[PDB]
Amino acid sequence: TPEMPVLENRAAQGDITAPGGARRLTGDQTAALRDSLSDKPAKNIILLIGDGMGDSEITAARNYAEGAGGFFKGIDALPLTGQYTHYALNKKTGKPDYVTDTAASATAWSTGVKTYNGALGVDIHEKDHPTILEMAKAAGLATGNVSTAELQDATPAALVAHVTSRKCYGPSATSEKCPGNALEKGGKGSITEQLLNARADVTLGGGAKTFAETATAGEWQGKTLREQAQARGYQLVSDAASLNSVTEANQQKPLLGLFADGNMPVRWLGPKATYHGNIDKPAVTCTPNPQRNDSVPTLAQMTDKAIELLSKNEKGFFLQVEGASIDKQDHAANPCGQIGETVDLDEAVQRALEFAKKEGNTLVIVTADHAHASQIVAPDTKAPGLTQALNTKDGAVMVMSYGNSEEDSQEHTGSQLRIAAYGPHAANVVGLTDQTDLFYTMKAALGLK
Amino acid sequence: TPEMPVLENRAAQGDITAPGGARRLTGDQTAALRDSLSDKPAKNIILLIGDGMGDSEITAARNYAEGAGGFFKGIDALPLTGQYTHYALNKKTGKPDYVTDTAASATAWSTGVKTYNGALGVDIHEKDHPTILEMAKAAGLATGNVSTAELQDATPAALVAHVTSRKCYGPSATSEKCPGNALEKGGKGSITEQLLNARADVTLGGGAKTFAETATAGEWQGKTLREQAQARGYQLVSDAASLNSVTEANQQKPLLGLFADGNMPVRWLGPKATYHGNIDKPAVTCTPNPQRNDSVPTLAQMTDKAIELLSKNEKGFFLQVEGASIDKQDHAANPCGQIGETVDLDEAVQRALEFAKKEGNTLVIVTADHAHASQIVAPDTKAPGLTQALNTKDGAVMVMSYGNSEEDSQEHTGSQLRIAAYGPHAANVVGLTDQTDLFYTMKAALGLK
Numbered sequence: 065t066p067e068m069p070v071l072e073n074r075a076a077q078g079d080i081t082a083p084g085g086a087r088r089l090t091g092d093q094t095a096a097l098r099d100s101l102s103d104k105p106a107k108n109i110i111l112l113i114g115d116g117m118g119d120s121e122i123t124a125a126r127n128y129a130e131g132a133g134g135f136f137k138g139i140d141a142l143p144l145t146g147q148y149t150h151y152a153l154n155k156k157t158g159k160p161d162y163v164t165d166t167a168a169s170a171t172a173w174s175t176g177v178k179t180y181n182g183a184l185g186v187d188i189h190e191k192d193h194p195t196i197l198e199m200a201k202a203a204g205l206a207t208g209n210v211s212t213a214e215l216q217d218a219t220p221a222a223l224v225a226h227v228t229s230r231k232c233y234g235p236s237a238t239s240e241k242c243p244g245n246a247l248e249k250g251g252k253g254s255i256t257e258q259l260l261n262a263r264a265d266v267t268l269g270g271g272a273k274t275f276a277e278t279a280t281a282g283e284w285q286g287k288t289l290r291e292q293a294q295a296r297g298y299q300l301v302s303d304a305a306s307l308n309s310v311t312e313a314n315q316q317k318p319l320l321g322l323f324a325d326g327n328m329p330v331r332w333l334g335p336k337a338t339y340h341g342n343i344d345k346p347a348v349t350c351t352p353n354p355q356r357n358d359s360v361p362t363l364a365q366m367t368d369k370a371i372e373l374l375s376k377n378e379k380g381f382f383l384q385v386e387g388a389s390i391d392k393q394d395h396a397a398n399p400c401g402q403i404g405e406t407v408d409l410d411e412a413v414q415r416a417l418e419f420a421k422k423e424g425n426t427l428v429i430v431t432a433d434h435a436h437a438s439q440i441v442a443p444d445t446k447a448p449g450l451t452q453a454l455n456t457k458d459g460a461v462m463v464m465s466y467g468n469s470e471e472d473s474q475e476h477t478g479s480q481l482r483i484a485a486y487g488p489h490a491a492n493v494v495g496l497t498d499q500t501d502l503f504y505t506m507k508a509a510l511g512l513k
Numbered sequence: 514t515p516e517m518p519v520l521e522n523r524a525a526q527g528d529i530t531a532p533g534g535a536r537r538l539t540g541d542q543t544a545a546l547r548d549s550l551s552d553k554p555a556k557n558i559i560l561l562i563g564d565g566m567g568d569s570e571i572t573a574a575r576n577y578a579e580g581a582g583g584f585f586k587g588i589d590a591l592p593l594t595g596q597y598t599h600y601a602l603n604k605k606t607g608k609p610d611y612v613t614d615t616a617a618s619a620t621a622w623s624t625g626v627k628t629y630n631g632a633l634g635v636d637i638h639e640k641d642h643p644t645i646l647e648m649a650k651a652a653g654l655a656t657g658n659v660s661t662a663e664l665q666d667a668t669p670a671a672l673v674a675h676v677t678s679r680k681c682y683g684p685s686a687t688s689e690k691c692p693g694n695a696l697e698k699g700g701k702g703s704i705t706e707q708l709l710n711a712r713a714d715v716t717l718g719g720g721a722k723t724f725a726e727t728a729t730a731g732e733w734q735g736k737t738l739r740e741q742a743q744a745r746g747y748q749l750v751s752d753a754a755s756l757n758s759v760t761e762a763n764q765q766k767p768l769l770g771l772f773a774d775g776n777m778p779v780r781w782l783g784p785k786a787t788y789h790g791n792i793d794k795p796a797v798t799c800t801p802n803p804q805r806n807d808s809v810p811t812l813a814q815m816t817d818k819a820i821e822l823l824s825k826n827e828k829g830f831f832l833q834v835e836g837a838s839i840d841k842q843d844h845a846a847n848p849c850g851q852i853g854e855t856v857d858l859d860e861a862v863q864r865a866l867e868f869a870k871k872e873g874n875t876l877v878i879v880t881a882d883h884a885h886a887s888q889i890v891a892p893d894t895k896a897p898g899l900t901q902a903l904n905t906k907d908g909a910v911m912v913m914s915y916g917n918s919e920e921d922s923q924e925h926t927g928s929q930l931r932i933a934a935y936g937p938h939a940a941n942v943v944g945l946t947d948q949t950d951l952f953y954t955m956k957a958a959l960g961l962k
């Protein structure tokens with residue numbers, strides 16, 4: 065039952081051109097904040113990650129989708145907020161590496177240890193460290209791992225795989241890139257093979273392609289990783305209808321959803337940003353991607369389904385949800401694809417907050433693994449990188465810039481970024497914290513050994 | 514034992530290469546945050562603005578001067594944090610202009626009304642609106658306006674001047690660019706003339722250059738603004754010694770510190786970023802500015818003296834302190850200058866918080882007017898803009914990039930950014946808020962009118 069308030073509205077209250085019209089607040093917040101502070105146990109935890117969703121990304125998406133004075137009913141609704149650092153480590157010196165990749169940062173909040181770019185579930189000495197999901201399982205809690213990316217991708221993989229390189233998707237890549245993790249060499253196996261061992265109750269995302277590979281050793285040698293999953297009691301789903309049909313998910317009948325060969329389709333389509341794209345060409349208006357359709361579950365749908373199936377566990381559950389393509393489209397200098405995935409994440413957050421407020425003992429956290437490239441710049445900007453003009457909900461033009469790479473892919477940035485929470489122990493994301501603190505916050509909130 | 518705590522130490526607690534070594538937290542923060550919430554009246558308010566100090570700028574400065582796992586005993590010590598928006602307005606359409614200049618954003622928190630870029634103390638209809646400082650004085654409180662920039666610059670000018678274009682420093686510029694404001698045309702006059710009229714208790718900064726002009730009309734026609742100042746009872750100083758000599762600052766003896774012809778000198782010097790600078794040039798170690806001097810008050814000293822002189826007003830006081838050159842050096846693509854001015858601001862913040870913790874009824878706020886260009890990128894980055902490698906306190910290299918402008922000056926970015934506070938009503942900066950909300954938060958905290 066509700067007691068801890070979720071922000072109902074932080075949109076501009078009135079006429080932004082008039083006095084007080086742009087205010088997002090309507091009164092003193094001292095009482096609301098006191099009502100948002102509780103150190104009682106968190107029975108469940110829902111961690112939503114917007115890959116590469118730094119403050120710049122959130123703002124850009126709000127400006128376009130909700131207007132500058134708009135409000136994300138999900139993402140902007142968490143009452144307790146802070147900024148956290150996500151630097152990685154140089155593998156050889158052990159010193160800080162100011163700009164992390166996704167594997168090292170995900171490893172940080174999932175295990176509580178800093179590591180080098182490319183590492184998954186291991187530290188700079190390549191020592192494995194239990195993940196919050198594995199720990200949740202060990203304590204008897206149900207577990208969920210959701211993502212719009214291929215499941216072998218760094219973010220969701222970090223919770224169930226321990227490999228020296230995030231490139232080790234299946235047996236093939238592992239034998240070549242992670243010889244020490246290769247199953248035929250006595251290791252724990254590829255990311256996909258370990259994911260199958262982790263056996264989370266609910267796992268949803270893309271990445272069906274790798275399951276086509278066959279094991280090089282072990283009990284299921286010669287069989288495809290898909291056959292192995294089937295043989296190990298997994299219930300495989302491939303689309304919205306089949307997913308909807310699922311009535312239960314547990315260790316006896318673990319759910320594995322493979323909704324795309326690789327990454328799942330993005331929500332919006334738009335051209336890539338170009339050189340002086342905001343000076344020469346006209347303004348862009350994003351448009352829905354036909355490849356999305358109803359046969360493909362949305363992030364909000366996968367979130368709702370996971371909560372349903374996971375909440376059946378009376379002891380509690382841990383669930384991670386990732387809006388993976390915000391980062392990917394940021395890399396491809398594509399504003400529409402980028403913003404569309406942020407809107408996507410916001411819906412997933414709303415579903416989490418909606419459940420969390422009713423349940424009353426659920427901690428919800430929303431943040432990103434690292435900052436990214438996109439910047440909001442003046443309309444008449446003449447930049448050296450890639451830019452694009454966009455027609456926002458405000459009926460005005462917003463220009464986005466990607467200027468940190470001459471190479472084909474735009475890159476991550478080291479700036480600290482927003483982390484927000486709601487529920488029991490949400491106080492621990494306020495002020496300045498580190499990405500590794502999040503692991504300890506989740507561990508403590510659930511009261512894990 | 515001051516009820517409300519100031520974050521003592523949120524640096525990495527140990528060996529960052531070890532599990533938990535990078536944690537900034539040592540325990541649950543629920544109790545600490547509760548102790549930080551109070552709705553009692555704020556007797557005093559100290560507003561510190563890092564011009565252009567976005568989260569990226571804060572992160573870069575911390576990385577270089579304190580190390581990635583370091584901690585700004587000032588900037589990072591405020592316990593209540595949020596993210597706010599600072600979009601401006603298109604003067605003709607009234608629609609949002611996603612990237613604001615300094616004038617419009619300062620007007621936003623100074624008057625509570627959004628406006629067009631370049632405007633100072635007026636809305637899009639060119640109508641004046643009271644500033645938090647003008648209101649504080651009228652309420653019988655002591656008023657202080659401190660900056661490391663020429664006092665006619667947008668940030669400190671927004672608290673005492675109402676003109677259509679921030680370029681209207683003195684009579685000359687005003688008659689040409691702000692005719693409707695030009696004194697000899699019935700207007701209230703230029704920025705400097707209006708500043709003299711505002712007559713704040715303490716005004717410290719640079720910009721003596723403009724005081725050489727002579728009024729075109731009014732009671733002090735033909736007389737220089739400096740002369741007018743002296744003739745109107747103003748107590749002027751021009752160096753550290755002369756400033757340290759003042760023992761009182763009031764309406765009959767208003768203090769006016771002019772320590773430089775234009776902007777005050779920066780703390781650190783370094784090479785300007787260049788094309789592929791991080792690749793073609795050696796990593797840089799910032800060098801102290803020989804011109805920094807010792808007869809020139811530091812931001813921290815001006816801040817400290819302002820508090821001494823203003824704290825005598827039993828009613829209370831309002832003080833705004835601006836670390837102005839963070840932005841200016843960010844425009845110049847000079848990491849060392851930018852970082853040094855952030856370190857400078859941090860010292861002033863420490864003084865503010867030290868006083869606030871003992872006074873017990875002081876609201877301290879640290880934020881910025883808008884985001885900027887600088888980004889922290891990977892060491893091997895090959896970007897199209899300007900870059901540079903730096904030797905940080907960690908004994909590691911950090912690369913910074915400025916890639917949003919082929920023109921002479923790097924530009925602002927529209928990303929929402931950090932705002933933090935300590936003391937009575939500090940809860941009002943938590944979560945998502947708008948820059949105009951800051952005006953009402955300060956007004957209500959002091960309980961004006």
Ligand SMILES: [Mg+2]
Nearest residue numbers: 115166219388
């Ligand atoms: Mg990812």
Ligand SMILES: [Mg+2]
Nearest residue numbers: 564615668837
């Ligand atoms: Mg300024």
Ligand SMILES: [Zn+2]
Nearest residue numbers: 115116166433
């Ligand atoms: Zn990422």
Ligand SMILES: [Zn+2]
Nearest residue numbers: 116166391395
């Ligand atoms: Zn990425």
Ligand SMILES: [Zn+2]
Nearest residue numbers: 564565615882
């Ligand atoms: Zn500025």
Ligand SMILES: [Zn+2]
Nearest residue numbers: 565615840844
């Ligand atoms: Zn500027």
